[PDB]
Subunit: 292 residues, 5 copies
């Protein structure tokens, strides 16, 4: 059976003439094909004001090393070892379109190497990634956030992203967003390789949101009623003023929460603006009739 | 008695052929059984909006090293030493379901080793850990937060979590949450070992929260009274407007504080929505009678 | 006179067989007695909502090294040297009950050693330390915050905290809190040594805070007057509504500022809740008389 | 074809007598001309209150090394290598006028070197850079933010910034700001070289912002109408009070959002101040007529 | 002319027997006189609530090394070199009274050394420094913030701060604060040397702030008028209620923005408290007359 001394001998022979900075290819004309695996874990939040989405992934990287091989029959059947992450060449994959907020406590600093040369490098990653958040169809809105990977500095004739396999690990249930992360995509080559996983997010219709929407709709009903109310009732100006106050309060309220960076504004805010405008016309008619 | 030179000799012989990256097992076919001890210290806060709980623990890790042993009679009865944490193999246990916000000033960077090979590694850990926070039965609500541990990269045929022993250290009294963290659980094996401690949290009924609840119930009494008030009293419309304003203010107020990510929304918020809806019907009846 | 070469020779001979990881004792059965000196500098703030106090200290640590000694007559009267902090054994004293937010720019990374073996290691420390904040007697409230020190990993039969000497350096004046940090306490031995300095904090009565009180008290006077006002004045309901609105606004206002984690809630908040309840009874009486 | 051994030999000969701290020039009297390339990627946000702009760039640095050269025919046609960033001399370019908030996960830590000595060093950079934000012509306002580069410590007789080439990479579309970053500028020599890229930012007129502006203009129309309303209508004081309340609410609202650091304040805020002042005069006239 | 080999030889001879931890003095009885140069760059903000001021400086440190000298005629006229900052003894100057928030990206990590031994060490430094902020004469207020320097651990018989030369670099114009930072001060010796630069800050009277102050004065005029209004006008109680509401809103508004840590509170806040108190007396008189 394999022993501690056997693994020590294997590692000592393995790292004899290894240069961490030289790409692991016998012939430097060949590229190293990297395939990345991005398994989402949890979607913490979708920050509307800052246009970010907070999530935790399981970014994995697989490639082939041609210098790190051995016949396992020569080393008591040792088929795999674990190396420190900083002793071996590692592709310079970056979270190109993201602010990476992972800590050193979430850095594994180790990798799995197989006797055929295949290396697995799996790392937890918490990302604050930019998303173009369009609140047009709020609150029945859908959105697309693309998580980008791009080789840092090696040209496509040196390092390439063969594929990106993205899935959802179903670790936790959201109850607010319906996430749809599935599919395989080849890498895109434009002077440096890069790929991206599309994340589709649909807001789930909760009874809490519809209960928060109920006051707005009934307020619209009340505006319609007062607009239809006789000018000579005598309470027109009073309740019109009070409900214009409340409507303006709701408009300010939504305005501080609605995203400012959208292809179009939200239909609901524009509809409440229209409501305020109609309330203004109702107040105008009431005062005009009052003077006349 | 043991001396500085004796301990120096022991350490020098001990670390002679130690490789930090090779699992500490004579036969590599055997697994290293790690038992983790997680003693909660203080529950700083339960953040509803961000779905996190802030706490400080005493995560301890115990395993057995087969290479680091000695007969203490051969070294003047030295029974235990202290080694720097980065010179010895350390299992790659991670706060899998948490954002670790500990500093390097909270890193001990040392471990205690016994002549039989047993290693103790105790470390303070401040965690921002994800919890599925359900505010259904607010404010008489209970919640369950699971703190996850999972070996990083070694397969179950290499490293396993034998057990997880979780307790409460009673270092401080909370006065807001009743914490119940006790029990022992074996590790779960699904391609990589992992375990979790269930934390049960019950909000304690404080005289302050019931005091804050008094305005709401008396507001309900007032709504009922005005709904029962004669249409021809003359104060119907005015008081309905003022108390609809107050109801909407309380609804907005709670809505900015209630969690948006819940299995069900909070009954109290839905009950205040019902209150506002009834106030709207009262206003509708008052205005209808006023016109007719 | 001592020279650069003399100090170089002394240091070279001093560090010849020094192991940073071996406790500095000739006989390992003896403990190293550490006496800590904690001189407060400034009390930045007392965060009520998060139950923290922000301050900057001058934590100093003094102990005795038995391996690092020399006869100064043998080295041209060199009586003291300065060593890098990471080359010498350092007791693992931790800010056990605090989040340490000091930077590496505030780390001295150097220590003073005397020819008798006595080492002084003084470091600035900015601490976010947990305090059980009771707002019962607000705003004439007092509080006690305990700053904890505890040896990290060495058992009491290896390392002990001999004493904790805490004082106030009077570097700056507060004008908001009266701080009382003075006294000497022996270390407490329960499986690992630890000590704590009790810091008493009394809010100073400022003319600004009494001014902010003035509206509340006069509002109470106004509530009493309107409660005494004749039911048949005709303005009862109007002022009752307006002042209940204002009362509820003040109640919400204080509620968002009062701590939620207290042994008892603040009497002033409960008194304003009683004021709101009395306003509700006044409104009830006014409407009842109005209908009847 | 070039091989791993060939690249190893080349690197070994290349770094034989290289000193990282000695400028890479045969004759030390000559300066090293650095040309910087700053390609903006995304303009995250323009923080008005803090006077910052958040963006992500592609800062590249190109210069010439005279010690690192080779005849490629002597090494099997190896024309370029990759070196670790910390083994070679690197110009000390700093984001002089900015808070750099990039992480170590966004640090490439490698550079591309060509057989002629030309080095390319491209790095992602997220900057929180100070801008003098003038909100005079709000919301039809334009602004100029200058991104500064300046050599850290070398005098102009040692290191110079030859040029700064700035462009927009069009990676993402903004939809809120029209960005205009294009042009080439020579370095400025005043005791230490430095250059800056001017960033012009124009707020795009969105249908959302005009919708938000509608309430204000109609409120002005209403103020004009009530100012023209007959003093003897009887409702003058009532609507004057209500609309002064609303005006003051809008004034406070904008005041908490308008920048406090401007060459001139925003005309719209001053116009709403004028509107409130006119409302005050209208209230004064109404009350004066009411008493008389 | 000097060459790369010449500088290499010079550095190799220079660092032959250099100990980074030994003060650079031939005779250890002499002190090293450090003169610091602190050139302010920009005053980002003056945070009233947290009592901090955010600024970026150009902290320079100059001293004399007696071991690092050479005759330049012996090395082809090399008159100055650049050394890595961590290879040479550096005085342990700390921003004693400040939170240093500089990044490693703003650390030069290099220093300029002259053949006479004079070393220049210039570094950008962004400081969050404590200031005793007195808002007595708000908004026509002036303030003094002292930036402290103090040697970390060396006694005055080892290291001394010869002088502190502070100036304003005029890099940017403020438009909100008039800064006056100029003058020279000797170091202060009380067991460890230290010095401080006094920075005077005067708020500039902006047309925006006076515009914000207009509502308050006109509100005072309105309070005076209603106090003078006939008790029997009929609008007394109504307008007193509405303007007491507005006064209380402004009082809360300013109270959340006024500093709580001042030698005296702000006169304007106390004046608005007096205004609210007078409004309360006016309301009291109106209601008293109404009942009687
Ligand atoms: C290494 C590197 C090369 C790059 N080339 C680039 N080339 C280009 O034409 N446009 C870019 O925006 C660009 N960005 C780069 C960023 C990095 C980090
Ligand atoms: C090392 C490692 C392996 C993993 N394998 C994994 N395997 C799998 O089937 N699903 C996962 O989500 C997964 N995550 C991993 C994460 C890490 C850090
Ligand atoms: C080294 C160490 C030992 C400990 N022992 C401990 N022992 C115990 O009984 N309760 C604890 O909470 C505890 N905490 C510890 C923390 C550390 C860091
Ligand atoms: C190295 C260095 C030199 C400097 N010289 C400087 N020289 C000067 O006249 N004014 C400055 O503001 C200034 N700042 C400097 C900053 C640095 C970091
Ligand atoms: C090295 C050092 C010595 C000190 N001495 C000190 N001595 C003293 O009498 N009072 C202090 O506050 C004090 N603080 C110190 C801080 C440091 C970091
Ligand atoms: C490693 O490189 C050296 C060159 O210094 C060579 O002598 C040796 O044979 C090489 N060994 C292997 C296993 O490649
Ligand atoms: C490298 O190229 C040579 C050229 O013939 C070829 O024989 C060799 O197989 C190549 N190396 C690999 C690993 O394929
Ligand atoms: C080596 O180990 C593998 C693991 O299952 C086994 O299948 C194989 O038979 C072993 N071979 C030898 C020669 O031990
Ligand atoms: C996810 O989206 C893809 C393409 O947009 C679609 O084919 C697939 O059916 C979707 N799946 C779910 C579960 O929404
Ligand atoms: C992706 O790459 C594979 C492998 O070469 C190829 O077969 C396939 O056609 C490519 N395109 C897609 C869409 O998969
Ligand atoms: C350590 O390993 C070396 C192999 O280089 C061997 O010669 C030596 O005997 C070993 N010593 C021990 C104590 O295992
Ligand atoms: C390793 O396996 C061999 C096989 O017989 C056994 O004799 C030995 O005891 C094992 N090692 C340990 C530490 O159990
Ligand atoms: C070694 O120390 C232990 C500690 O209690 C003691 O029990 C034992 O008798 C000692 N043995 C010898 C041989 O000193
Ligand atoms: C804690 O919970 C467990 C399981 O829910 C239960 O058996 C135990 O009695 C509880 N203890 C306390 C103190 O609530
Ligand atoms: C846990 O592991 C132990 C040790 O093998 C075993 O005896 C026990 O049955 C397992 N299950 C539980 C619930 O303890
Ligand atoms: C230091 O330890 C070595 C052991 O290798 C010994 O030979 C030497 O005499 C010791 N010197 C001192 C000063 O203790
Ligand atoms: C250590 O113990 C021995 C036992 O007699 C004693 O002689 C010696 O003085 C002790 N060491 C010290 C430093 O006291
Ligand atoms: C050594 O220095 C101290 C310092 O004051 C002095 O008192 C003492 O006389 C000196 N002794 C010798 C021998 O120089
Ligand atoms: C501080 O508190 C201690 C104990 O509570 C007391 O003895 C002492 O007089 C107090 N000093 C001041 C200045 O309050
Ligand atoms: C503290 O320790 C000292 C030193 O042993 C002792 O004299 C004293 O009695 C202890 N207790 C107190 C309260 O000081
Ligand atoms: C490198 O420098 C050494 C000086 O120690 C010299 O002997 C050698 O010839 C130099 N080699 C090259 C390639 O410059
Ligand atoms: C350095 O100066 C000498 C002086 O004549 C000149 O010959 C040489 O070409 C210069 N070096 C370079 C690289 O131009
Ligand atoms: C070296 O490689 C370049 C790359 O295109 C090629 O143009 C050139 O002909 C090659 N020369 C030799 C001698 O192989
Ligand atoms: C950008 O600004 C420059 C100078 O201000 C001008 O020449 C150029 O036309 C502008 N381009 C755009 C697209 O606005
Ligand atoms: C900039 O530098 C270049 C190169 O020396 C020079 O030709 C040009 O005149 C300079 N000025 C401008 C505006 O380009
Ligand atoms: C440096 O110190 C060594 C002591 O090991 C001495 O032999 C040598 O002469 C010294 N050289 C210089 C230049 O001081
Ligand atoms: C050190 O002191 C001696 C004592 O005479 C003196 O000669 C020498 O000049 C001093 N060193 C320096 C650098 O002044
Ligand atoms: C050395 O360089 C300086 C720099 O200006 C010059 O003034 C001096 O004449 C030069 N001396 C020699 C000997 O080259
Ligand atoms: C700055 O203040 C000093 C002393 O307070 C004074 O002498 C000087 O004239 C002032 N300068 C300015 C520009 O305010
Ligand atoms: C400051 O130090 C200098 C140099 O020793 C001295 O001339 C001066 O008198 C001291 N005092 C002042 C106020 O400059």
């Amino acid at each position: 059976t394999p022993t501690y001394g056997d693994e020590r001998l294997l590692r000592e022979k393995l790292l004899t003439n290894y240069s961490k900075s030289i790409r692991p290819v016998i012939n430097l004309t060949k590229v190293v094909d990297v395939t990345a695996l991005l398994y989402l874990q949890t979607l913490y939040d979708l920050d509307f004001v800052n246009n970010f989405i907070m999530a935790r992934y399981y970014l994995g990287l697989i490639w082939i090393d041609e210098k790190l091989t051995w016949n396992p029959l020569d080393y008591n059947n040792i088929t795999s070892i674990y190396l420190p992450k900083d002793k071996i060449w590692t592709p310079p994959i970056k979270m190109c379109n993201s602010m990476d907020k992972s800590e050193e406590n979430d850095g594994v600093g180790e990798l799995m190497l197989t006797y055929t040369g295949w290396i697995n490098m799996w790392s937890f990653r918490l990302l604050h990634t930019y998303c173009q958040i369009n609140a047009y169809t709020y609150p029945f809105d859908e959105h697309t956030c693309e998580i980008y990977l791009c080789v840092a500095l090696h040209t496509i004739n040196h390092t390439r992203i063969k594929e990106l396999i993205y899935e959802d690990s179903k670790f936790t249930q959201n109850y607010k967003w319906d996430i749809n992360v599935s599919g395989k995509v080849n890498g895109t080559d434009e002077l440096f390789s890069y790929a991206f996983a599309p994340m589709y997010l649909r807001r789930k219709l909760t009874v809490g949101i519809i209960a928060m929407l109920i006051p707005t709709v009934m307020m619209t009903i009340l505006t319609i009623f007062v607009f239809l109310l006789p000018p000579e009732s005598g309470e027109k100006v009073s309740l019109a003023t009070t409900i214009f106050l409340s409507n303006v309060l709701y408009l300010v309220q939504i305005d501080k929460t609605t995203p400012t960076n959208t292809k179009y504004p939200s239909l609901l805010m524009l509809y409440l603006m229209l409501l305020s405008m109609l309330s203004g016309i109702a107040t105008l008619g009431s005062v005009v009739i009052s003077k006349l």
